[PDB]
């Protein structure tokens, strides 16, 4: 279930930077953010 989450969230990161495609570092930042939010409860 978290893989769908990381795919959903990786788009918002490109949205913030006003881009048109999704780079790999966006994926990894989304990965770390999901790990971190899961680390709490």
């Amino acid at each position: 279930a978290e893989v769908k989450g990381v795919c959903t969230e990786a788009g918002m990161y490109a949205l913030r930077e006003r881009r048109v495609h999704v780079t790999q570092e966006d994926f990894e930042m989304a990965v770390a953010k999901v790990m971190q939010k899961d680390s709490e409860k």
């Binding site: 959903t8 788009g11 918002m12 490109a14 949205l15 913030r16 006003r18 048109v20 999704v22």
Partner: protein, 278 residues
């Protein structure tokens, strides 16, 4: 004959003597929630083309919740002040009416006016009154509440992703809510409002105390470093109480002893630390 569109309820938030006027500066430390509500509501007004191109499925409904005393309603005030499009606010428990059928009408016309007027925003505060889990289908009052909930859901679901109508809905206890409301496609965003921890407490103190003369030698770091997980609506009461304490004795500059006695007055936690267990 036909009529030009006419309705009732909350009219318009007439925008002259109605903006409650709270700048974004009076809200401190809540940058996360600020930025994400901004991109949830105001950005889709303009950057819709990006959504279509990337394919991220623009969100429609947003629900925010948390423990009492964390400024959920202050964001609604801030947005209503700074918005450019139409704004509408209603109280969750006004839809119920004695005369049969007035509730459903009052909902459908609110939605109709919001639709035909402009790219508006509806705001419903404290919705625990209507949407709840259980029911009893013999008392009648539950019958009216059922009809209201059903057709509200129906008509929120009837929009076409073109008329740019958004909904902001807030609540106090998120436990007793029917999940059928938060089904995907209706209220797609959930926002949690926690309590300040360390970073926000200092910012709240620094912003609040800018209005008082507050002497010159008072120290604030002595109070932020303490541990007591107070809410965000207690910082305000702390500063207010110290100010009144100074007024009592006819001195118009607040001193440190004021802060001390005020802090002790507000908190009131005895020990609750029964020791021989440790």
């Amino acid at each position: 004959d036909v009529l030009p569109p006419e309705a009732d309820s909350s009219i318009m938030m007439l925008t002259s003597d109605q903006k409650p006027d709270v700048m974004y500066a009076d809200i401190g430390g809540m940058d996360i929630q600020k930025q994400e509500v901004r991109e949830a509501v105001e950005l889709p007004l303009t950057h819709f083309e990006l959504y279509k191109q990337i394919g991220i499925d623009p969100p429609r409904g947003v629900l925010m919740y948390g423990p009492p005393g964390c400024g959920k309603t202050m964001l609604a005030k801030a947005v209503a002040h700074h918005t450019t499009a139409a704004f509408i606010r209603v109280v969750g428990s006004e839809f119920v009416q004695k005369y049969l059928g007035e509730g459903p009408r009052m909902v459908r016309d609110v939605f109709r006016l919001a639709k035909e007027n402009a790219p508006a925003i509806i705001f419903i505060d404290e919705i625990d009154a209507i949407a709840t889990k259980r029911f009893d289908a013999q008392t009648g009052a539950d019958r009216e509440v059922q009809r209201i909930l059903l057709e509200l859901l129906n008509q929120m679901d009837g929009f076409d992703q073109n008329v740019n109508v958004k909904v902001i809905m807030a609540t106090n206890r998120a436990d007793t809510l029917d999940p059928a409301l938060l089904r995907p496609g209706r209220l797609d965003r959930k926002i949690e409002f926690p309590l300040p921890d360390r970073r926000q407490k200092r910012l709240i103190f620094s912003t609040i105390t800018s209005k008082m003369n507050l002497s010159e030698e008072v120290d604030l770091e002595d109070y932020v470093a303490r541990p007591d997980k107070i809410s965000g609506a207690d910082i305000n009461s702390i500063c207010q109480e110290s100010g009144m304490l100074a007024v009592r004795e006819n001195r118009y500059i607040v001193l440190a002893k004021d802060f001390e006695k005020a802090y002790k007055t507000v908190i009131k936690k005895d020990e609750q630390e029964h020791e021989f267990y440790k």
